[PDB]
Design a protein around this ligand. Structure first.
Ligand SMILES: CC(C)(C)c1cc(NC(=O)Nc2ccc(Nc3ncnc4ccccc34)cc2)n(-c2cccc(N)c2)n1
Length: 261
């Protein structure tokens, strides 16, 4: 009914990108010229108004470092259409062919951009709740955009969230820090060796991950401020961004290209 709507002759479903739970994800072309990502609803495997809740958010939330909602088709079969990202999600990108070649400069930059997005989310008074490498999209020239693929991620979750349901932007700052390890370890699931329950008692007993192999120390300090027990001591995203944008000038101007970072 609104300005976002387009005919289905414009939509060229070309290559599939996995069957979700309540539909499929598609790589394709809109208006025969624009590389596009299409999300499907399998009719009557979910409330229509539930499936369109997505686009209603993506309309509200617009920023260079966020997913772009392109277009909707809001009559069965229903199609949500969003800007295509050539590299797919960050997690894949990290532990795939390219991981080999990424260093701290490329990694902190990706991280800078995420913060940038997540900072707009701050200014929006919205919470994410599942910020983490699986939820970031990469495209050309290492562009990173915040997203949510619709995917119990306790390992990434702040204890006030995992425990008492107390979900804030500060609990998103906890995730960021975890994400900072995903980036510094090229994909490796945080708290290796630990089963969930184990993690949960452990960070309550105050345990944090060590600085990973060859990651500088000021990157870890930064991580730790994200993992402060008290939710309100954690840095603002505005802070984090700045910190990371200025990193190799203001913090590691003495940084030397390593074996893995
Ligand atoms: C912005 C915020 C955080 C507010 C947001 C964003 C989304 N939704 C998405 O981000 N959806 C999404 C759309 C398309 C792809 N796939 C892809 N998109 C582009 N390129 C790809 C290249 C390869 C593979 C895939 C894709 C992945 C996720 N939110 C949301 C709200 C309510 C329910 C659900 N479930 C999500 N909230």
């Amino acid at each position: 009914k609104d300005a976002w709507e387009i005919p289905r002759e414009s939509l060229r479903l070309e290559v599939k990108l996995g069957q979700g739970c309540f539909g499929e994800v598609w790589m394709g072309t809109w208006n025969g010229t624009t590389r596009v990502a299409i999300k499907t609803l399998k009719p009557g495997t979910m409330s229509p108004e539930a499936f369109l809740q997505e686009a209603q958010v993506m309309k509200k939330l617009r920023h260079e470092k966020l997913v772009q909602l392109y277009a909707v088709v809001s009559e069965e079969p229903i199609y949500i259409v969003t800007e295509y990202m050539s590299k797919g999600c960050l997690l894949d990108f990290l532990k795939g062919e390219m991981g080999k070649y990424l260093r701290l400069p490329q990694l902190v930059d990706m991280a800078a951009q995420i913060a940038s997005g997540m900072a707009y989310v701050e200014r929006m008074n919205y919470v994410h709740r599942d910020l983490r490498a699986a939820n970031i999209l990469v495209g050309e020239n290492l562009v990173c955009k915040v997203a949510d693929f619709g995917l119990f991620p306790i390992k990434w979750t702040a204890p006030e969230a995992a425990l008492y349901g107390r979900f804030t932007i500060k609990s998103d700052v906890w995730s960021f820090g975890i994400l900072l390890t995903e980036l510094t370890t090229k994909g490796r699931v945080p708290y290796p060796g630990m089963v969930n329950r184990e993690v949960l008692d452990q960070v309550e007993r105050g345990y944090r991950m060590p600085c990973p192999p060859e990651c500088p120390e000021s990157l870890h300090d930064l991580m730790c401020q994200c993992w402060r027990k008290d939710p309100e001591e954690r840095p603002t995203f505005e802070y984090l961004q700045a910190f990371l944008e200025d990193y190799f000038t203001s913090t590691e101007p003495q940084y030397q290209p390593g074996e893995n970072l």
